[PDB]
Amino acid sequence: MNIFEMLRIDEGLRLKIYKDHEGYYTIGIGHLLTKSPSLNAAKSELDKAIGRNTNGVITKDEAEKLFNQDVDAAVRGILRNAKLKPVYDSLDAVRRAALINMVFQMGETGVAGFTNSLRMLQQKRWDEAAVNLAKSRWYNQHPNRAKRVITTFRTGTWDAYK
Ligand SMILES: [Cl-]
Ligand SMILES: [Cl-]
Ligand code: NI
Ligand code: NI
């Protein structure tokens, strides 16, 4: 298992524009287009990203390309951030994926605000970190996914994804 498979499982794949659980326009594999209510606005962002006139519809290859870029970006976000990098660096391969999963979903900045969990992860206090992570809007708004990620951090295995 690896980061791509992981997130592909967590985000699903949709080739047509859609409103996510928060009402934001998205597409592909968890690619947020815009927080704006205008579908035209989302259509324009999509066309700009793809480089063609899409009509709100994309191909699988295209969706995978957006995903690769998005995965690349999450990683760079982690490496650039003074708070994330040291944690990332301290972790093992499986857990790094869990970290990437979160940065992908909520951005460098959202993850960097989980101060206490970050610190516990850095100390390898798995059970405490998992309890701390669960106290969040993140968890309450994405119960199933959040449990899979927290479980990964807790265990250091891909068991949650089998
Ligand atoms: Cl883009
Ligand atoms: Cl969920
Ligand atoms: Ni595998
Ligand atoms: Ni969400």
Side-chain angles (χ1 to χ4, degrees):
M1 165 113 7
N2 61 59
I3 183 57
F4 291 89
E5 293 177 10
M6 185 193 204
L7 273 169
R8 158 72 167 89
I9 278 161
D10 290 327
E11 307 274 5
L13 168 71
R14 322 250 324 249
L15 299 177
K16 161 102 187 178
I17 288 183
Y18 78 92
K19 287 236 265 161
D20 80 355
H21 76 115
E22 314 252 15
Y24 301 144
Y25 285 125
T26 299
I27 196 167
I29 303 157
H31 186 92
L32 162 81
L33 288 165
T34 188
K35 320 219 267 132
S36 163
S38 193
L39 170 85
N40 310 296
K43 256 150 149 259
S44 145
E45 287 299 305
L46 184 55
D47 292 354
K48 158 164 74 84
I50 294 302
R52 81 189 175 64
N53 224 91
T54 68
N55 195 37
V57 190
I58 61 164
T59 83
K60 177 190 214 104
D61 288 335
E62 292 179 331
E64 285 176 9
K65 196 142 195 239
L66 290 182
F67 187 39
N68 286 301
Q69 295 169 179
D70 287 347
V71 173
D72 199 76
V75 180
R76 305 230 250 69
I78 286 163
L79 320 160
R80 281 209 270 91
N81 197 291
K83 287 125 100 356
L84 295 183
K85 194 198 167 232
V87 180
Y88 185 73
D89 274 346
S90 74
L91 294 172
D92 56 87
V94 181
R95 288 185 177 91
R96 281 172 175 164
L99 188 54
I100 293 165
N101 189 312
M102 294 186 73
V103 178
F104 185 97
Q105 175 185 16
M106 62 200 123
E108 193 198 331
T109 282
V111 184
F114 274 62
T115 299
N116 312 309
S117 315
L118 288 181
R119 237 201 349 256
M120 289 162 202
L121 289 168
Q122 176 142 27
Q123 303 166 162
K124 310 188 137 49
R125 295 160 98 99
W126 330 118
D127 290 82
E128 294 166 63
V131 163
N132 188 268
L133 289 167
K135 298 171 118 196
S136 59
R137 172 181 206 272
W138 165 72
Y139 181 82
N140 292 118
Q141 311 294 144
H142 322 77
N144 295 308
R145 187 218 187 122
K147 305 187 196 112
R148 291 181 294 267
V149 177
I150 290 176
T151 294
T152 304
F153 276 125
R154 213 211 302 238
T155 73
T157 77
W158 297 108
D159 301 332
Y161 290 84
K162 291 171 285 203

